Write a protein that binds this ligand. Structure first.
Ligand SMILES: NCc1cnc2ccccc2c1
Length: 165
């Protein structure tokens, strides 16, 4: 079970933690991946989660894309969680470094509402280029299910908690 999380709202919790280490420890029903439309898990959270599965997440993802085609920005798919979780919810937040609509961030967070509890990163944060303070605000105003946010960066975690309205 989840431990050491700071409660932000009725249903949103946050911790300064590596989401791979958090997943390996808790083994949640759902771990969220910060995916791209192609499910190419190269860097950031996706690269780290895939490397922890010994590339099994990428192999499974390539078969999914070969069958179904790419996801939509703001969309998701449920795949195996491998050694990290029962399931991985691959969610595509807009990548502002690729010029994608930041307004799609709320649609991306709506995917979390189909799962009662999730371990997740902040969508569109990190290498996706959005303001993590904005991502946390969209998260608390969109997600109604129980979300345990893992923020890798200590200095960003402190800034997020200290600025939370
Ligand atoms: N310790 C593996 C690792 C590497 N890179 C990361 C990037 C974002 C979030 C968590 C990460 C975890």
């Amino acid at each position: 079970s989840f431990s050491g999380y700071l409660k932000l709202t009725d249903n949103v919790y946050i911790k300064n933690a590596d989401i791979v280490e958090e997943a390996k420890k808790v083994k949640p029903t759902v771990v969220v991946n910060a995916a791209n439309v192609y499910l190419k898990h190269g860097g950031g959270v996706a690269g780290a989660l895939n490397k922890a599965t010994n590339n099994a997440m990428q192999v499974e993802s390539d078969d999914y894309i070969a069958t179904n085609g790419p996801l939509k920005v703001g969309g998701s798919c449920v795949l195996s969680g491998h050694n990290l979780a029962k399931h991985c919810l691959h969610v595509v937040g807009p990548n502002v470094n690729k010029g994608e609509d930041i307004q799609l961030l709320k649609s991306a967070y709506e995917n979390f509402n189909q799962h009662e509890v999730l371990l997740a990163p902040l969508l569109s944060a990190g290498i996706f280029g959005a303001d993590p303070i904005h991502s946390l605000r969209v998260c608390v105003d969109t997600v109604r299910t129980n979300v345990y946010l893992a923020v890798f960066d200590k200095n960003l975690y402190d800034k997020l908690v200290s600025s939370f309205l």
